[PDB]
Design a binder for these strands. Structure first.
Lengths: 122, 56, 229, 48, 119, 115
RNA sequence: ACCUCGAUGUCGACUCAUCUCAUCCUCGAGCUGAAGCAGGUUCGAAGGGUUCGGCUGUUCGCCGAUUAAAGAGAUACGUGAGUUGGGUUCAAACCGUCGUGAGACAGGUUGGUCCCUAUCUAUUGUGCCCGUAGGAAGAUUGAAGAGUGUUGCUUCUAGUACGAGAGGACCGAAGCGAGGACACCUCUUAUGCUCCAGUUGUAGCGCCAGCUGCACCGCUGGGUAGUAACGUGUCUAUUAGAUAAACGCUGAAAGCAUCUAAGUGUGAAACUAUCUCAAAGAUUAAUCUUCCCAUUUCGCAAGAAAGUAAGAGCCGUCAAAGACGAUGACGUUGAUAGGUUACAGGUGUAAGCAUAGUGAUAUGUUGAGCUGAGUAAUACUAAUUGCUCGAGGACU
RNA sequence: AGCGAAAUUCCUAGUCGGGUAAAUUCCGUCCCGCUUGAAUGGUGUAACCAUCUCUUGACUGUCUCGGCUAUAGACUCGGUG
């Protein structure tokens, strides 16, 4: 499905433009990507309009995949847009406003003010 | 590939003797002669349904 | 643990919305009630087993030795019979239903046939790897897989016995354990079981007690609001 | 299983022929006490 | 696979089915291999069921699987069949024609089968 | 034993809604979704059209595509799911079922509907 | 230099791995100038795993990104009758050099072809003969087995103990898991090539319309069943026996004591019981069961003739199955396949009629058109009254 | 003079910069120049090379991650063989 190396935009006011997935954290052989999961990424394009610069390897969070997935509650959520977010190891990223929708899978892991701040909560 | 020897008569027979033919089904005609295979039209026309066919 | 169970046949499979209004893969199975033909108790037959009769058919299409044995035991005419070893014995001739055999939440094991794939290669029968075909393909990429523990005068110079090779795949009953009992029904001997059923079309399932535990019943049922507006 | 141990020992002390394995078949050793040839009046001996 | 007998795909299969159904309707009976005979009989049953009801729509529907043959032109074929064959079998539900096993041909020594109709 | 295989209706009746406003590929519809969070009962409203509708009684599913402020989201629901409140909005001219060209078109280019 | 110089494919990569521990993690434990955290040292033990991108004729070598860990050694330096040929070491040529020069450098580069229809040992599944010992067949046992026995995160218990202070434990439970074995296409995706709708050109059909062939199954959109995954569904056990490290309690030798010399518990992802099934030709041919008849009798108990009814095979309707065999039912005693019928599904108002539009076109027609394999009753067709062998319990 | 690790330089994985998440790629800067060298040219040059590379766009079944069907055989049947 959603294999890595897919340049995507951001979801908040961070100045960065593009970023690519590089590796899977911890156990390998995952080979795929899912919504609301923390994955180590390699930035691909980040103009100095913010704080991110090209050549940085950190763990970003993807929330939108155009391929979509089946959540085991009985909701086949499939998106048509791609974007991610970079959290500073807490419940708030650098941007003031959160653009783009956000999944509710990231609930028992916290991060509810982001839902209240994002444009859509599905 | 190939070996460095020949295959004698016995190996071939062990291959050939198990290629031997078998028996067949059979159907005695209930109205005529010319004994025929089972589920097959007898070679003298008159078949069960009718003379669906001819002798030749 | 205590061994009980009943037979079954696949009569469909779809989604069922259980409690919390969440989808569960539920397979509808027609269970075949078994009429006990007796018990082959140990110290009397050396292998304890409850003899179950099944495939209820008529009389004029029966075999004289089987018919004679069936009448000697006076068991009601069913086409076939089988034993379940170490199964809890029951009286000769009775009503066997999964609703009374188990609870609506116990854990059971199943035994269902698979699909006949005909002759099949390793990658689809043992699920081995297939490498890239780019930068030139040419020769067959998937025939048997290359192994070399034998080369020269004496390293192995032959293959170990049991190396999975040419043959037919599938069309064999597979036993899976630890499947929950989901729903109880007795209108037409129907049951509900969670998961995906082995068998391509019209598979027959042998269901007995799971052998990891006797099966702890937990309350799970279906939730729905059948309303008209 | 201990009778098969004696089977292996005697089969290792016999000359390897078809007669050897037939002699092995001609031995009825079992761990239990209930058998069938005791009805044939077996002459009791020891170390023959 | 390069130069050889090029193809025996389902296109040629349905083409041969059309040729054989046209022939058997042109001669009331045909003798061919049983494997092809059964597929021919299925298509013949479908055509017969289509021809049971008669109308310009039904004629158009029937005119999608027939071709001109000798001793019976396609128009002559249609006329003769719709005149006699369709009403004759309009009382038997299913099992319209009869297929019976024949002997082997001299050429390929392969099994043949005879399909008969117009009772 | 011979089974009619009509048990699909029997398992439907234990999961069926009694009104269930139906739809075809090419009809706009809004779907109300009651959610029991026990702290915020969100009546999720999903508007759009059904792109493909699976039938066969109990396997009846359908994908609805919403465009929330220019964000296209196509989500596949199921007919027999509880808490489903389908409210029919309008019906359009069903040109071909399983609309695949409606998964790529957007507003100011939609099809006509019926009040 | 012992033969393979009367041909040794002898690298890398990929697949398959396997074998051993000097296990790396992983399991447990002891010791420790080891408060805890965090360690180090020593010991036994393999169940699984021991990552990836890149450059390089490279695993190498290095950079960078992850886990509790990114192992080591081996298979003519694993794997060219498995594949490629990526090249020192071709021929063709160049760069710089050397040689007076043919050419060469133990230097680099442009470019470049590494066959096999399997005779057999080996290996895997399927089939016929009979044994199997009165035959035939159902239930089986089980002698020996295999698969499998992997792993982490978080929280509650606990910021609890611990030092005092930051910091901060193993484990009881829970969920989250990865990853694979397995199940099917149930919902999502894919597929669907005799399935249809839109759909142009030629060719034809007196003509419009309409049909067909070809033009990538003319094409695009889908989809019945089946078949896969990109889909979610079972599991990652427990138990016991002996257990390694490792303590034991008693206790002698050697009037104290001391796991040991006697007796006596403990305890490792290690081994096996235990889980999944195969599994009597298992010659160790194992048990029970029922039916068969014992319808005479020259000959060696029923062939010198009556020769199973138990069945078994042939043939066909077929199909979970499906290279053939076999597989399971059915075979006129009749519903086993195809249908006949109605239905699911879509294909989405067919043609055509009528109305307005020059015409395209806008509405009833009408979910209409049909359905390979989808759901069910179905003598309507096909499954022959068809052929062959087939017992006297063979001997204690 | 010029050019100077390159197809040429042994010290090499030549210094440094660029890019690359990550450069045994490549291009520029110094110049490890046994063997730098001026018509077996010293520097480069417009167009072009089935010239040799290096990077990207778009793109894909090459990988992820393989499945269905069709032809063609492999399977059976008949003829040679």
């Amino acid at each position: 499905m959603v294999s890595f190396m897919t340049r995507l935009n951001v979801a908040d006011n961070t100045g960065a433009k593009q970023v690519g997935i590089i590796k899977v954290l911890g156990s390998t052989r995952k080979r795929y990507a899912f919504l609301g999961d923390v994955v180590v990424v390699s930035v691909k394009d980040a103009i100095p309009s913010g704080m991110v610069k090209k050549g940085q390897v950190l763990r970003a969070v993807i929330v939108r995949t155009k391929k979509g997935q089946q959540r085991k509650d009985g909701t086949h959520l499939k998106f048509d847009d791609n974007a991610c977010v970079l959290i500073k190891e807490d419940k708030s990223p650098r941007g003031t406003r959160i653009f783009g929708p956000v999944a509710r899978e990231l609930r028992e892991r916290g991060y509810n003010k982001i839902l209240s701040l994002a444009v859509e909560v599905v | 590939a190939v070996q460095q020897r020949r295959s004698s008569k016995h190996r071939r027979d062990k291959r050939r003797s198990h290629d031997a033919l078998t028996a067949q089904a059979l159907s005695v005609c209930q109205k005529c002669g010319k004994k025929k295979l089972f589920h097959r039209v007898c070679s003298c026309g008159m078949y069960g349904d009718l003379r669906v066919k001819k002798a030749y | 643990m205590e061994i009980r169970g009943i037979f079954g046949v696949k009569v469909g499979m779809s989604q069922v919305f259980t409690t919390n209004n969440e989808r569960l893969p539920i397979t509808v199975i027609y269970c075949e009630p078994n009429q006990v033909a007796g018990v082959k108790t140990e110290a009397k037959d050396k292998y304890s087993a409850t003899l179950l009769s099944f495939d209820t058919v008529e009389n004029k299409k029966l075999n004289k030795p089987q018919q004679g044995f069936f009448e000697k035991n006076n068991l009601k005419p069913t086409k076939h019979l089988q034993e379940i070893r170490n199964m809890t014995g029951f009286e000769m001739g009775q009503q066997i239903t999964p609703q009374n055999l188990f609870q609506v939440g116990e854990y059971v094991d199943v035994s269902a046939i698979s699909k006949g794939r005909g002759f099949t290669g390793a990658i689809k029968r043992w699920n081995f790897k297939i490498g890239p075909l780019g930068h030139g393909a040419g020769y067959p990429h998937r025939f048997q897989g290359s192994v070399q523990a034998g080369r020269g005068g004496a390293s192995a110079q032959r293959v170990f016995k049991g190396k999975k090779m040419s043959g037919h795949y599938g069309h064999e009953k597979v036993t899976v354990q630890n499947l929950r009992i989901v729903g109880f029904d007795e209108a037409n001997m129907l049951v509900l079981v969670s998961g995906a059923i082995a068998g391509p079309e019209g598979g027959v399932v042998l269901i007995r007690t799971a052998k990891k535990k006797p099966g702890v019943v937990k309350p799970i049922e279906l939730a729905v609001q059948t309303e008209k507006a | 299983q201990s009778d098969k141990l004696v089977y292996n020992a005697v089969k290792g002390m016999l000359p390897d022929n078809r007669l050897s394995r037939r002699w092995i078949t001609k031995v009825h050793v079992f761990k239990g006490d209930k058998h069938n040839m005791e009805a044939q009046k077996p002459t009791t001996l020891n170390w023959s | 696979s390069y130069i050889n007998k090029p193809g025996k795909t389902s296109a040629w299969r349905v083409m041969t089915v059309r040729q054989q159904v046209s022939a058997v309707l042109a001669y009331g009976k045909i003798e061919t291999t049983l494997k092809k005979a059964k597929n021919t009989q299925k298509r013949l049953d479908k055509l017969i069921t289509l021809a049971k009801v008669d109308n310009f729509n039904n004629r158009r529907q029937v005119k999608k699987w027939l071709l001109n043959t000798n001793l019976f032109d396609v128009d002559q074929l249609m006329d003769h069949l719709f005149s006699k064959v369709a009403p004759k079998y309009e009382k038997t539900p299913g099992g319209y024609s009869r297929v019976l096993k024949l002997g082997p041909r001299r050429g390929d020594a392969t099994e043949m089968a005879i399909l008969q109709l117009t009772d | 034993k011979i089974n009619k295989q009509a048990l699909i209706d029997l398992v439907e009746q234990k999961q069926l809604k009694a009104y269930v406003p139906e739809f075809s590929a090419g009809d706009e519809v809004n779907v109300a979704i009651k959610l029991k969070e026990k702290e915020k009962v969100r009546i999720q409203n999903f508007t759009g059209t059904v792109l493909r509708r699976r039938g066969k009684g109990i396997s009846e599913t359908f994908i609805v595509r919403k465009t929330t402020d220019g964000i296209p989201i196509e989500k596949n629901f199921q007919i027999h799911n509880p808490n489903i409140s389908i409210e029919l909005k309008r019906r359009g001219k069903v040109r071909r079922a399983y609309i695949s060209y409606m998964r790529e078109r957007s507003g100011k280019a939609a099809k006509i509907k019926e009040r």
